[PDB]
């Protein structure tokens, strides 16, 4: 029987599922890091505005 | 009580009417279908059997034929019966349209059964449950009617 | 039929399934990255508006 073909197909599907999960996790991490960078940039803009207010 | 006993006997008769495989009625209670290598596939589950008009063990060979691309399934199987040709084919739902086409493009109409372990065990024990219902109906109603 | 056509039945289905899975995973990753970028831009705009 085609046990080798069955095993190859199953392993390929498992590896593809693992790769999909890893890619989803990487995209989520990129979104979280970009949100953190956006928050840091907003805080820096607020700090620059506060420094401008202190200079005023 | 007599009605209950008759209903239990009818249930037992219906359970026993199911031919043990090789026909439109499967032998999932006492066949090698759920425990075969067709149990789980890469992205589907393989389930197929037939009553071939050519010879027994045909559905096992037919999977090894060109139909293996008609459904991403491939597995060994031990399914045979001399009187009525028995076998098991491999077909995956990842090509469910093509799998159904491969099951229909033969002398046998589509014929598959639940290979899940829990469902298989429940189906196998359903006959025992019907037999026990008949036996308990006998034991209870016979004594009650004697009284 | 006969098992003599192994060249298109032993591994052709496996290759097709692997290609479909890889394409689906790549499309999902690209869509997730694009959605992450869009949500990052929206969150940046919202945070900048609040800070302003």
UniProtKB/Swiss-Prot annotation, chain A:
N-acetylserine (modified residue): where? 1
Q: Write down the superkingdom of origin.
A: Eukaryota
Q: Where in the cell is it found?
A: Vacuole membrane
* Extra remark beyond the main annotation: Present with 2280 molecules/cell in log phase SD medium.
Q: How does it assemble?
A: V-ATPase is a heteromultimeric enzyme composed of a peripheral catalytic V1 complex (components A to H) attached to an integral membrane V0 proton pore complex (components: a, c, c', c'', d, e, f and VOA1).
Q: Tell me, in a sentence or two, what this protein's role is.
A: Subunit of the V1 complex of vacuolar(H+)-ATPase (V-ATPase), a multisubunit enzyme composed of a peripheral complex (V1) that hydrolyzes ATP and a membrane integral complex (V0) that translocates protons. V-ATPase is responsible for acidifying and maintaining the pH of intracellular compartments.
The Swiss-Prot or TrEMBL record describes its family as follows: Belongs to the V-ATPase G subunit family.
Q: What protein is this chain from?
A: V-type proton ATPase subunit G
Give the classification, highest ranks: Eukaryota, Fungi, Dikarya, Ascomycota, Saccharomycotina
């Amino acid at each position: 029987s085609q046990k080798n073909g069955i095993a190859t197909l199953l392993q390929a599907e498992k590896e593809a599922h693992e790769i999909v999960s890893k890619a989803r996790k990487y995209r989520q991490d990129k979104l979280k890091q970009a949100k953190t960078d956006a928050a840091k940039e907003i805080d820096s803009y607020k700090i620059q505005k506060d420094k401008e207010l202190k200079e005023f | 009580t007599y009605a209950n006993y008759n209903s239990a006997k009818t249930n037992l008769a219906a359970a026993e009417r199911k031919k043990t495989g090789d026909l439109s009625v499967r032998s999932l209670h006492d066949i090698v279908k759920p425990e075969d290598f067709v149990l789980n596939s890469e992205h589907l589950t393989t389930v197929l059997v037939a009553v071939p008009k050519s010879l027994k063990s045909d559905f096992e060979k037919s999977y090894e034929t060109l139909s293996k691309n008609v459904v991403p399934a491939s597995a060994s199987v031990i399914a045979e019966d001399a009187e009525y040709v028995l076998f098991n084919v491999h077909l995956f739902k990842k090509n469910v349209q093509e799998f159904t086409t491969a099951a229909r493009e033969k002398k046998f109409i589509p014929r598959e059964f639940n290979y899940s372990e829990e469902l298989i065990d429940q189906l196998k024990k359903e006959h025992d449950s019907a037999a026990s219902l008949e036996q308990s109906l006998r034991v209870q109603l016979v004594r009650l009617a004697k009284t | 039929l006969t098992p003599n056509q192994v060249n298109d039945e032993l591994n052709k289905m496996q290759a097709f399934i692997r290609k479909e899975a890889e394409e689906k995973a790549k499309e999902i990753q690209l869509k997730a990255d694009q959605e992450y970028e869009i949500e990052k831009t929206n969150i940046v705009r919202n945070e900048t508006n609040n800070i302003d």
